[PDB]
């Protein structure tokens, strides 16, 4: 089994909780966002070889959680673009999460779809998301003037 | 005037004539060694502007045999020419050739009209077509 | 477990008991204690070297 | 191009006779190794078995050494080719009938009408060459190459997806068609040039604007022959002026120019020459470290066959392991790459993988 | 290699130096091979 | 480009920065100038004059131009020629000399690589300009014909093989409210297009030949195929598009729906849930042959006899209209007679699926032309005069002599040869029958060329045998022979070829034999024989 060998069963449970009944969906989102390092873990599970669940479900979960607020959206943008490692992670603890081992800013069709969903959804806070995207573009252009 | 002899024999000529000239030089081998080595060293700078690729095999065989005469100047000039040529070749690369030789590993860029040589199990075949039997 | 949570009342009760935080915490902790056993760059490069140190042989 | 097989009928002494159907000026004879044989004899005759019957060459070690006859001078006109094969007397066997090359049209039809019926063929094959070039461009300009910096790309390379195989096959077919037809066009141009010279027209008559106007394939061939001569000269030996010429900022550029984008033969030979010349230098080893840090860096945009150059680096390091500086430099590089986790940079995992596997290979070799 | 020389005794022969050419070619090939083996 | 699309004045700032009001500058200007409203502002300052004057001056052998710089600017014109507004201007008056100028450069310090790059760029430019713009087709055909008038080899043949003689590809932009997963890979792949096409799983762009159908598009975009997929268009609002419709019919419908011609892409909406007879649009080869340029090509120019027959038949006026009914077969025959083994799309003409129809196709299309060309009008008499002048009948008679082994006054391989020779003889007899009877028309050489030829001896040899079962199996061959005899009887002026073993006597002999067999105890063959017997009896006394 892949469920017994990996940590993907919990993700399937979360996807079922979020998407089974659309009426309660918002409630579930409000209970999930405040957990620490959840977005980083989901993103890490997204960019790995197929281990038991397909990419579209992970994309759906990430989009649904990342749109229930505005701080969460900015955190997700930072995760996808500029830094995807764990938050407050010192290797001196041996118990805190440590999501090293993956390069920053890797592009795949799933990432492009998530970014497009985040950018072009009409809701409060969309202006802040566009501001963050343009700020990243400006920073990338500026850092190119390294000589 | 051995310098001009080599210039008109191994360059600006065909394949059979070059083979015959190499034959004549080999016959004339048996004081001549160092003189012919100097002549070939002087003519090496003019080598890149030759005409046929099959006209250099016997020439390089002769240089390989007579390299025992001297090892200092020949190596220096040879290294200088290698350094000079090396840079120029790199500038002619195009993305398509690199992509072809990386993704599929197919060299000998097929978008250049000009070729220079052919080979078959150690035989040089140029300026002559294949016999259709 | 999925069959148990097939109804709205069951999901609401599960949320009230705080299970939704439980599963997220479990996912975050369990990802830390597992190494991916799939193949990666190293296997590819070993294949490129053409050799190295029901499908069975 | 031809393609032949023997459907004639090996316990009996045998002979075969072939007719070209026309007196053909043969100028190249090649045969492959014939293991099931003891002797081979050659007979050449145009019209009669005794009026003009001649023999070219007889050899008995064809099974040990394949007979290669590059050229015949003077070239004898022939039409009937007899090969007598004497197998070892001590089931049926197949013996390939080698390869033969020569010229068909003889000049002192007979008139210089060829200049009218070669130029048209040259133009036609040139048009086909342009067609093949455009076809290859329009087919192969719509392909990509994933970089090897993730598990997804690694698994893509391990097991090719179904969609890529057909594209590979089509590109391969187009490439082989284009190269064959390029060869045909070059041969036609060469024949036209020969005929133009025959009538009495002369052939074509500073290094700058001479180096940059030459042909690329000529450059590759001359570099190959030149460097092979250098390697043979070094093997026959200890140069010192040659050592003075080669130093820092001179070996690196040479390696980058030739080994990265050359043919496998020139790559291997250049690597061997470099290891033979600068094997025991002090700056050696740090050169390998810098090359590895540059080419395989995650910030490199150049495209090249990483696996082949990796094997070349491994082979060079195995020979150069004596000076003890190469392994020290590699260990220093590995130490530097792992700094971030010790105490805002991050970890370059692919680079670490490359360097650690190289070090593992070297340590395995030094273990004996 | 293969010690197979075309019939040249009948005509004014260069074979006495063609054989030398063959030996020099074989010597260069062997030297290159031993360089590769080092 | 998106930034400039939002703010029009930013494009003016860009142009001022450029200095207009190298390769990198030119490519950046080409890419950034794709907005529907910034393009007109680009065209109004420095776009046409400099480039067109420079290229014209270079062709004649004004900013200075070198050999290397010629390709980048033409590539720029290629890249900017996407909007319909630009594509219309490319067919304008002032741009007309340009095309001809390029031909003057390519029909005669230009190195090999320079020449190859220039010719490739010119081919791409012409192909783009002629992509799906019917208005430019007339101009291009006129340019080609005036070049031809005032054998073919060199760049012109390459242009003919590329621009013509092949199908056309078009770009379709599909968008759906549901994700489309087919055709994608998990590996990284940098695919960059214009921002109007978007990114994600809800958009797709396909560059595919017009010969396909809607079912092919659905299979290529979605793996799912009453749950079905309906393709909608804004102009055809509310009308689901049947999957059997071809892309040619789509283009014709949109063009008659006042959609601007030559527009860059076709837009469709893939939603989840009277037009079948629409005429396809005309291919560029059809437009070129409409004015009669194929005859000029024929006069300007592997069974040798069949290729020679096809080439000779191509000379006849009106041949192109009948021949181009099947685009694939016509283009395959034209490429084969043009000295090219393969179409260049990845297949060999000898390996084409229609290889069994090619050898006899010229005879069938010539017979169709004969049947479809009445002799009442001057077209018929001019066709007869031209055919007699070019000696098509002479070649037909020579082929009949060679195949029937009637000189004028491996076992399995042998069986295949005799069967194909019988088929060829049947085709030739049908062609001759249609030539004699379409349904001063009699040439002077006629009634004389047929005599002493192989026609009468061949008919005598074929009809001499009069059994009831040995040759009763050759129903189509004898149907063709009796149709030819009926055509002979139809034209009175050439009847005396029959009147003085005897055709009528022994024909009535087998007719009586088969009538007796029927009375005592293949129906189409016997009824055709009876009808031919009646017609021969009627014409025998007259």
PDB file of C-alpha atoms in Angstrom, chain C residues 3-40:
ATOM      1  CA  UNK C   3     -17.872   5.959   4.634  1.00  0.00           C
ATOM      2  CA  UNK C   4     -18.475   7.124   8.218  1.00  0.00           C
ATOM      3  CA  UNK C   5     -18.185  10.809   7.243  1.00  0.00           C
ATOM      4  CA  UNK C   6     -20.627  10.563   4.332  1.00  0.00           C
ATOM      5  CA  UNK C   7     -23.301  12.816   5.881  1.00  0.00           C
ATOM      6  CA  UNK C   8     -23.568  16.457   6.898  1.00  0.00           C
ATOM      7  CA  UNK C   9     -24.343  15.684  10.544  1.00  0.00           C
ATOM      8  CA  UNK C  10     -21.327  13.390  10.837  1.00  0.00           C
ATOM      9  CA  UNK C  11     -19.024  16.019   9.333  1.00  0.00           C
ATOM     10  CA  UNK C  12     -20.402  18.728  11.625  1.00  0.00           C
ATOM     11  CA  UNK C  13     -19.917  16.535  14.697  1.00  0.00           C
ATOM     12  CA  UNK C  14     -16.405  15.636  13.536  1.00  0.00           C
ATOM     13  CA  UNK C  15     -15.607  19.339  13.220  1.00  0.00           C
ATOM     14  CA  UNK C  16     -17.056  20.091  16.662  1.00  0.00           C
ATOM     15  CA  UNK C  17     -14.873  17.427  18.297  1.00  0.00           C
ATOM     16  CA  UNK C  18     -11.784  19.055  16.783  1.00  0.00           C
ATOM     17  CA  UNK C  19     -10.795  16.288  14.391  1.00  0.00           C
ATOM     18  CA  UNK C  20      -9.975  18.664  11.544  1.00  0.00           C
ATOM     19  CA  UNK C  21      -7.087  20.124  13.537  1.00  0.00           C
ATOM     20  CA  UNK C  22      -6.055  16.601  14.522  1.00  0.00           C
ATOM     21  CA  UNK C  23      -5.640  15.377  10.948  1.00  0.00           C
ATOM     22  CA  UNK C  24      -3.675  18.467   9.896  1.00  0.00           C
ATOM     23  CA  UNK C  25      -1.310  18.099  12.849  1.00  0.00           C
ATOM     24  CA  UNK C  26      -0.917  14.402  12.053  1.00  0.00           C
ATOM     25  CA  UNK C  27      -0.068  15.151   8.420  1.00  0.00           C
ATOM     26  CA  UNK C  28       2.519  17.768   9.368  1.00  0.00           C
ATOM     27  CA  UNK C  29       4.205  15.502  11.918  1.00  0.00           C
ATOM     28  CA  UNK C  30       4.107  12.346   9.788  1.00  0.00           C
ATOM     29  CA  UNK C  31       5.701  14.040   6.784  1.00  0.00           C
ATOM     30  CA  UNK C  32       8.699  14.777   9.018  1.00  0.00           C
ATOM     31  CA  UNK C  33       9.264  11.117   9.936  1.00  0.00           C
ATOM     32  CA  UNK C  34       9.230   9.607   6.419  1.00  0.00           C
ATOM     33  CA  UNK C  35      11.811   9.489   3.618  1.00  0.00           C
ATOM     34  CA  UNK C  36      10.660   9.236   0.019  1.00  0.00           C
ATOM     35  CA  UNK C  37      11.486   5.778  -1.305  1.00  0.00           C
ATOM     36  CA  UNK C  38      10.909   6.607  -4.976  1.00  0.00           C
ATOM     37  CA  UNK C  39      13.793   6.975  -7.401  1.00  0.00           C
ATOM     38  CA  UNK C  40      15.532  10.244  -8.182  1.00  0.00           C
TER      39      UNK C  40
END
